[PDB]
Design a protein around this ligand. Structure first.
Ligand code: HEM
Ligand code: HEM
Ligand SMILES: CCOC(=O)N1CCC(Nc2cc(C)ccn2)CC1
Ligand SMILES: CCOC(=O)N1CCC(Nc2cc(C)ccn2)CC1
Ligand SMILES: C[C@H](O)[C@H](O)[C@H]1CNc2nc(N)[nH]c(=O)c2N1
Ligand SMILES: C[C@H](O)[C@H](O)[C@H]1CNc2nc(N)[nH]c(=O)c2N1
Ligand SMILES: [Zn+2]
Lengths: 416, 416
């Protein structure tokens, strides 16, 4: 009937019934980063009608089933219209309102997202009429400008044309809209973001000119209508960055660190009512730890931990001194302080965690559940200090949903 | 053939084949604290021979199969001897060496234990001849004394009589050998460990005299041969405690905090070759965060976070200031500093994490796998700063294994 869920801090009990609406096979492989169950791969043929129609009906029912006061007539009319469109065209087009509803629901259904309390606040850019890479670039620039909003970050998503036969997919090869390059220097050292070494080389191979800087914004690698990807530099005027300063340590700015203000996932696929949108970049605003802990402290990223430790005069040669804990916290403080001082939206991980708890509470009350991946929801630092750490959660895949995809360079058939 | 596992920090890839030897049904319910798959409940009848014999053979094969130079003759002889013992008695007795091997393997197979690099270093106390509660108490006192070793903590396990028909189970009702009481005071405030309020009341109901202190060591509630549980106060001379001091903040000792040196799990069940040992308390040494973060900072425990924040002069009314991160770290420092100064064994979470990574590496090389529960292995603070956070892991149940049990007070049939 339902799965019992407990919060080991408050003792509160919740009953999950929403998981019954979960889809296909899932994964215990809970700590796997990219499992097949969260990935929706490529196709070389259209979606079978016997599969598409049932999913379409289900979605249309969910949509009309979300209104406070039902519109029975339109409901049946839409069901009929969709069926006919599927029989006569082999697929169907969502109405703008249906699409907007789908993007918000997919967000609402993202298990790894801690900011879902904001799920109903999302700007949707309809680019389903897009046809060329140049046009893709223009839509993306518009999105970046709208979302950045001079520091007052706004959540948005741009929806490109849905997959047809799988041979004309629109795809952004970048993992994020804004990301820094990584270079293997002559002296053997790595400059910039070490995690983007390969993609940076790809951009260079495609004609992009390397600048060999520590923070060079990568170009957009856009694939339109299944054609070979084209490279487009992002106009620097559209990239807002925050220079890192510490409220007490004057020497922190000496590190010469900075980061972009816009966190945007560029390579996921939106699944809705049987349809698949391979290109749908979206953004929210940053949670401090993403930059302060992952970008700056991951060893395979900018890895500034030891340097900050020395500057603080800590015993960086004695793990037990907990110098790493002291350093990472001052870095997190620098990040929050800098974004705040420069009037750029950002939320600390404690506030975000409490924010998600309220949302989870609202969700179980509203629809009896909230798909959640504990492993991704607990912040990278101060785990049990946040309420989410003590909350049991159920992870499942609903629909609409945002899926991972197989890296395009691994499946793309080049024209030349 | 094998499951691919990746470390997102080093990029290293591992192949898991050991999971094939996993047992019954498991649980995505990865973040559930006490799932049925990790629990081995009570019985009212002996283990069916058709089930017991196969498990017994399997274990005996594993045992003789662990020697560098095989002893084929003894192997077959033991297999024969066990079968005959099962046919003639309905069960069988493990040899001392088999038991020792079983306890270490169960530890080796504990997915939620970060200290498994020490798996082969374990003292085993054979109390399978035990018959009364008083004798249980004596064995437990011997264990506590041996393990504490004046501060130089030694890992040990005491094995009581195996389950026969399920009506004569030996059980320690306590969750841990050493734990502090919790009291609901007249003015409505809670004194001591809030998480033990119920168990404390149980002890009081059984005759134990409450002292109403902040750190009153709870008595042992021992069930022998299926009889009603008897209460035994632990001789104070056997309980080593560490008074909490901070290396810089003189005011920290003013908090009047202390904690016990011995971390001992008292209520789990050891499963081996078809046999079940409902009473087998074991101990290792503490990892700093258990006390510094969970005991002292969990809101439903001693909850000292805010008080420490004020004393540090932090902005405890502004979450974004990250005052909680600063406070918890100084508390962790106090814990490590105090244990060290008082010459009591303890390991910080960074060293422990690296320790486990080395172990995991050894395990995949030695037997192609290492059952691991990421959710329990990543420390409660500084998650991604530790290497374990970036390591994909596979969680499965092997045999021998340490299982949870249904709380005894929920299934016990009182004589009076
Ligand atoms: C409003 C502010 C928002 C905040 C603060 C927030 C925060 C986060 C954080 C911290 C992560 C973890 C990223 C990582 O560790 O790589 C995440 C993941 C995710 N977010 Fe949100 N989010 C917000 C808005 C959005 C929006 C607008 C959408 C979609 C419409 C969304 C969709 C997702 C998805 C699908 C993931 C998983 C990404 C992956 O698996 O790599 N988020 N979010
Ligand atoms: C040598 C030092 C050891 C260290 C530092 C270590 C550390 C830990 C830690 C930190 C936990 C988490 C406890 C919690 O969060 O409640 C744990 C759990 C566990 N440990 Fe170890 N351990 C050690 C020795 C042992 C020994 C000797 C055994 C058994 C023979 C063992 C069996 C387990 C088991 C079964 C669990 C899971 C307990 C549960 O699920 O509640 N450990 N250990
Ligand atoms: C390692 C580079 O990481 C990133 O560029 N990002 C980190 C991962 C991802 N974060 C996000 C995404 C969203 C949509 C909202 C808040 N935070 C996008 C930005
Ligand atoms: C909340 C009370 O917690 C405890 O008494 N403990 C915390 C949980 C458990 N920790 C352990 C157990 C072992 C065997 C080794 C190291 N650490 C036993 C001690
Ligand atoms: C192996 C493990 O799945 C990996 O390190 C995880 C842990 N939790 C995470 N949580 C978030 N939010 N983002 C991440 O990239 C990761 N990576
Ligand atoms: C809900 C969740 O399972 C619970 O809070 C967990 C998280 N990780 C843990 N990890 C350890 N080591 N010990 C714990 O008690 C817990 N509790
Ligand atoms: Zn699972």
């Amino acid at each position: 009937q339902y799965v019992r869920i407990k919060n080991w801090g408050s003792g509160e009990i919740l009953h999950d019934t929403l998981h019954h609406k979960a889809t296909s096979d899932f994964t215990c492989l809970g700590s796997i980063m990219n499992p097949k169950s969260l990935t929706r791969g490529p196709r070389d043929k259209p979606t079978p009608l016997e599969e598409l129609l049932p999913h379409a009906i289900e979605f249309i029912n969910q949509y009309y089933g979300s209104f406070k006061e039902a519109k029975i007539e339109e409901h049946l009319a839409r069901l009929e219209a969709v069926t006919k469109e599927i029989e006569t065209t082999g697929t169907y087009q969502l109405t703008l309102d249906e699409l907007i509803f789908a993007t918000k629901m997919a967000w609402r259904n993202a298990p790894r997202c801690i900011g879902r309390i904001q799920w109903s606040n999302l700007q949707v850019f309809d680019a389903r009429n897009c046809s060329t890479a140049q046009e893709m670039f223009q839509h993306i620039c518009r999105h970046i400008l709208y979302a950045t909003n001079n520091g007052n970050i706004r959540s948005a998503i741009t929806v490109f044309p849905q997959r047809s036969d799988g041979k004309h997919d629109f795809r952004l090869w970048n993992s994020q809209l804004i990301r820094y390059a990584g270079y293997q220097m002559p002296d053997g050292t790595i400059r910039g973001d070490a995690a983007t070494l390969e993609f940076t080389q790809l951009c260079i191979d495609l004609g992009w000119k390397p600048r060999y800087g520590r923070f060079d914004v990568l170009p957009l690698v856009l694939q339109a209508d299944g054609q070979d990807p084209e490279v487009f530099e992002i106009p620097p005027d559209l990239v807002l960055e925050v220079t890192m300063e510490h409220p007490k340590y004057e020497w922190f700015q000496e590190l010469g660190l900075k980061w972009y203000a816009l966190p945007a996932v560029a390579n996921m696929l939106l699944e809705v009512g049987g349809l698949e949108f391979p290109a749908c970049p979206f953004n929210g605003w940053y949670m401090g730890t993403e930059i302060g802990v992952r970008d700056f402290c991951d060893t395979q990223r900018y890895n500034i931990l030891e340097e900050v430790g020395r500057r603080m005069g800590l015993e960086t040669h004695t793990l037990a001194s907990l110098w790493k804990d002291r350093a990472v916290t001052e870095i997190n403080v620098a990040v929050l302080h800098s974004f705040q001082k420069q009037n750029v939206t950002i939320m600390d991980h404690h506030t975000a965690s409490e924010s998600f708890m309220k949302h989870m509470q609202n969700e179980y009350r509203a629809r009896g559940g909230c798909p959640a991946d504990w492993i991704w929801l607990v912040p990278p630092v101060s785990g049990s200090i946040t309420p989410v750490f003590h909350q049991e959660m159920l992870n499942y895949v609903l629909s609409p949903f945002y899926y991972y995809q197989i890296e395009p360079w691994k499946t793309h058939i080049w024209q030349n």
